Amino acid sequence: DRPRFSFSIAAREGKARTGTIEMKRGVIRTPAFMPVGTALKPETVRATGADIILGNTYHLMLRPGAERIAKLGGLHSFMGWDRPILTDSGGYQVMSLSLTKQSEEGVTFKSHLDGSRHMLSPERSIEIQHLLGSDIVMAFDESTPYPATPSRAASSMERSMRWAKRSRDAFDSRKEQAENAALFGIQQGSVFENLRQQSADALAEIGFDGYAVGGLAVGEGQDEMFRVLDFSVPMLPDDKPHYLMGVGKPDDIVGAVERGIDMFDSVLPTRSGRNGQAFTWDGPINIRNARFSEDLKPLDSECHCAVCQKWSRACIHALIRAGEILGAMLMTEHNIAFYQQLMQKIRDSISEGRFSQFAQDFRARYFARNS
Amino acid sequence: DRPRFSFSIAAREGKARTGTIEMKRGVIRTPAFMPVGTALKPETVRATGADIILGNTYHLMLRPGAERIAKLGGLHSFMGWDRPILTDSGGYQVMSLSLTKQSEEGVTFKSHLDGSRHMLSPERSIEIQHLLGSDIVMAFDESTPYPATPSRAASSMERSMRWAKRSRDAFDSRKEQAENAALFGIQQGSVFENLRQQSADALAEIGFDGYAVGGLAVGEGQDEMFRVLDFSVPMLPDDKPHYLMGVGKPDDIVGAVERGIDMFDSVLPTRSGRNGQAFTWDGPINIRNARFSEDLKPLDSECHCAVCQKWSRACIHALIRAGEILGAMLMTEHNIAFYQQLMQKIRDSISEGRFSQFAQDFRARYFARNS
Numbered sequence: 001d002r003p004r005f006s007f008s009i010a011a012r013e014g015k016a017r018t019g020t021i022e023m024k025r026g027v028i029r030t031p032a033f034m035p036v037g038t039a040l041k042p043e044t045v046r047a048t049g050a051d052i053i054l055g056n057t058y059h060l061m062l063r064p065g066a067e068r069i070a071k072l073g074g075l076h077s078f079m080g081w082d083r084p085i086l087t088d089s090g091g092y093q094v095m096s097l098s099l100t101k102q103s104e105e106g107v108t109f110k111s112h113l114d115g116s117r118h119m120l121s122p123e124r125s126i127e128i129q130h131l132l133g134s135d136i137v138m139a140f141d142e143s144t145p146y147p148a149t150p151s152r153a154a155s156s157m158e159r160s161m162r163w164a165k166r167s168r169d170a171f172d173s174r175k176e177q178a179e180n181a182a183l184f185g186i187q188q189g190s191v192f193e194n195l196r197q198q199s200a201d202a203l204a205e206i207g208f209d210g211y212a213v214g215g216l217a218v219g220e221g222q223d224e225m226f227r228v229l230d231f232s233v234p235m236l237p238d239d240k241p242h243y244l245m246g247v248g249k250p251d252d253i254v255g256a257v258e259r260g261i262d263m264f265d266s267v268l269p270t271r272s273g274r275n276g277q278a279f280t281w282d283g284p285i286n287i288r289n290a291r292f293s294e295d296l297k298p299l300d301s302e303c304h305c306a307v308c309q310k311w312s313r314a315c316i317h318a319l320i321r322a323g324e325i326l327g328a329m330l331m332t333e334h335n336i337a338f339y340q341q342l343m344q345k346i347r348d349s350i351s352e353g354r355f356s357q358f359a360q361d362f363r364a365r366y367f368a369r370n371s
Numbered sequence: 372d373r374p375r376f377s378f379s380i381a382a383r384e385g386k387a388r389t390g391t392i393e394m395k396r397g398v399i400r401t402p403a404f405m406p407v408g409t410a411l412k413p414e415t416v417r418a419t420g421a422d423i424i425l426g427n428t429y430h431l432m433l434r435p436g437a438e439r440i441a442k443l444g445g446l447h448s449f450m451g452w453d454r455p456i457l458t459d460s461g462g463y464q465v466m467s468l469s470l471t472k473q474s475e476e477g478v479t480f481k482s483h484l485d486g487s488r489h490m491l492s493p494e495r496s497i498e499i500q501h502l503l504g505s506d507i508v509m510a511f512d513e514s515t516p517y518p519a520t521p522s523r524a525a526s527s528m529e530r531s532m533r534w535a536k537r538s539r540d541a542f543d544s545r546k547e548q549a550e551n552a553a554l555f556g557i558q559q560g561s562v563f564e565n566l567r568q569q570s571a572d573a574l575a576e577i578g579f580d581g582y583a584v585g586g587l588a589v590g591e592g593q594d595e596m597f598r599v600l601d602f603s604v605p606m607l608p609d610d611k612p613h614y615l616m617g618v619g620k621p622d623d624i625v626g627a628v629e630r631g632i633d634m635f636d637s638v639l640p641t642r643s644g645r646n647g648q649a650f651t652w653d654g655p656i657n658i659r660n661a662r663f664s665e666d667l668k669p670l671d672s673e674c675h676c677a678v679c680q681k682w683s684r685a686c687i688h689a690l691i692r693a694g695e696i697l698g699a700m701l702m703t704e705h706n707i708a709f710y711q712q713l714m715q716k717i718r719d720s721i722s723e724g725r726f727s728q729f730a731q732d733f734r735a736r737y738f739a740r741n742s
């Protein structure tokens with residue numbers, strides 16, 4: 001009988017950890033990369049190694065709507081994915097894509113599709129994520145645009161913490177949700193150490209199944225992101241998963257695991273694949289470049305994915321140049337699989353106590369760009 | 372103002388001729404190859420060089436039916452092809468695919484699809500081809516299976532000639548058809564010279580816009596087919612087109628033009644393309660063969676088709692091995708275009724009085740198979 005949510009750390013190296021999250025719909029190996037599910041077939045996404053995928057609540061609210069998804073059987077039935085699904089709260093896309101009114105109560109916003117009015121709040125976000133039936137639920141917070149003044153960073157963080165308690169109570173009010181799903185809280189505080197500590201203390205007092213580091217990957221650059229992670233991750237409870245939302249490039253992931261992060265999500269592998277960019281151990285490549293037109297090697301000569309067992313750079317180049325959808329599908333499958341192989345090498349190297357070496361070896365090769 | 376049907380011979384070499392057939396829907400360059408239209412887009416088929424395509428009356432009768440096609444605007448609207456269309460009579464597929472009753476009146480047969488009853492005769496065939504709206508109409512004849520006894524060959528040929536007169540009269544009875552389309556008669560007589568002469572005399576007495584050589588390409592082998600063509604084609608009127616039905620391989624076409632044939636049709640380029648076989652100037656190749664997996668040359672290094680300007684053997688090999696429909700589409704486009712380039716080289720070489728040399732050069736290279 002599988003548990004609701006059980007995080008076990010199997011091995012450590014410095015701040016890095018590797019282990020598992022056991023949930024009713026399956027086991028998640030950590031550090032984990034979650035592709036964004038909101039197209040490749042779900043069996044293809046699973047075969048790349050993904051243990052869990054992410055759904056964007058905001059987009060699902062606008063089309064086809066969470067009530068419709070619930071009537072269809074829930075998000076797992078809707079997406080054809082029967083393993084765990086994490087949903088975000090919707091709040092970030094409200095800031096970035098939609099906004100009629102904002103207050104401590106919640107937000108009202110207009111659909112950028114058809115102009116209809118929608119509402120989000122801690123209580124409404126948790127309820128919508130319940131209708132979607134997701135396994136990991138994100139608390140609803142307030143995002144502050146980058147760069148943020150110290151005043152606005154403190155203001156949004158304190159509101160986010162009040163909203164985190166409201167998210168906690170809303171989640172706990174539904175027995176069907178509280179017994180079967182998990183709830184993560186989100187640390188805020190921009191680049192400010194005292195605000196991050198304030199946030200971490202408040203979240204740990206409320207209590208969550210996992211803790212996200214919010215407010216990064218919004219324009220700040222890698223060096224600054226790493227500096228914030230340096231002091232922010234140790235503030236979170238050690239025995240629970242640490243989730244860096246919206247990150248990121250392969251070298252961002254490696255450096256964040258060095259700093260204690262267990263979970264990641266990013267649209268980058270799928271966006272790059274649609275745009276003709278492949279990730280490789282020698283850095284990203286643009287497959288349209290003429291140098292690939294007669295290159296019989298696969299996208300990456302070490303990649304274990306199904307695409308690289310069969311297709312050459314030359315032939316993917318031909319498909320992409322012709323605008324054939326198969327080209328984009330193959331690139332996208334490869335990129336998601338490459339990300340999963342990166343996570344597997346990270347997990348194995350932590351287990352063997354050679355992750356610090358792997359990270360240095362990885363960077364030297366990825367940035368040399370000898371592709 | 373384009374004429375109904377005007378055949379002009381521009382140049383000759385021995386028995387070979389090159390010229391044009393002018394019709395209301397366009398000009399047909401001869402010797403001509405007609406792809407079988409009954410999928411690639413019609414604009415793709417046109418871009419390969421085809422001036423006219425063939426429709427199979429029998430298949431169109433069974434699905435969706437000629438009355439339905441007429442209500443949809445005719446076969447040109449149905450197929451998206453606004454240039455000339457030749458239709459066969461349906462009689463060959465009755466023998467080869469369906470057959471309730473046969474007599475001098477006509478035939479009743481059962482649809483191999485749904486068992487429904489259909490009827491063909493000279494009068495019904497011409498009427499159905501009128502409903503289809505085709506530009507070149509084939510007289511309805513009686514096919515004799517191969518090999519045929521002298522008695523059965525004479526019996527089917529004499530009936531075919533009585534049916535050719537009935538086809539002539541049926542065609543002439545519809546002013547809309549007789550003023551806008553053309554009618555071809557079909558010579559029969561198996562391998563027997565006296566029967567072929569009997570047939571040719573009867574057809575010329577009736578009078579037709581063009582004359583087909585029927586009863587070949589049904590198992591007899593090329594040497595025997597060529598021997599029959601040697602005496603049969605000179606029996607037909609010189610100033611009208613000569614049509615060899617259902618032929619054939621590239622070397623069959625070359626040898627038949629040497630013997631006075633102006634028009635051809637065959638499913639071979641499309642069937643081969645779906646089966647992973649490409650025609651080349653060095654003979655056919657099976658693209659699945661391992662030797663092509665890293666071959667960066669196009670299917671044929673002299674072929675002018677759109678496929679060979681872009682796609683390598685290696686990449687078409689990859690698509691075909693994966694079962695991707697694009698692979699079959701590219702092979703089929705190439706094969707139809709290769710056939711049209713063969714016809715163009717035949718036309719140009721006759722015009723220049725070097726066709727006998729082209730035919731010898733063609734055979735030496737095609738049969739050496741240095742691909």
Ligand SMILES: O=S1(=O)CC[C@@H](O)C1
Pocket residue numbers: 035036037038039040041042043045046053079080081
């Ligand atoms: O990310 S997925 O597995 C592929 C598209 C949806 O079926 C969810």
Ligand SMILES: O=S1(=O)CC[C@@H](O)C1
Pocket residue numbers: 060061062064065066067068117118119128
């Ligand atoms: O079905 S929904 O997601 C909830 C009500 C609207 O915001 C659309």
Ligand SMILES: O=S1(=O)CC[C@@H](O)C1
Pocket residue numbers: 406407408409410411412413414416417424450451452
């Ligand atoms: O042979 S065709 O041009 C292609 C399939 C039909 O549109 C007729």
Ligand SMILES: O=S1(=O)CC[C@@H](O)C1
Pocket residue numbers: 431432433435436437438439488489490499
């Ligand atoms: O519409 S049809 O081609 C003429 C009547 C049947 O043979 C089907």
Ligand SMILES: [Zn+2]
Pocket residue numbers: 299300303304305306307308334335337338
């Ligand atoms: Zn790969």
Ligand SMILES: [Zn+2]
Pocket residue numbers: 670671674675676677678679705706708709
């Ligand atoms: Zn070609």
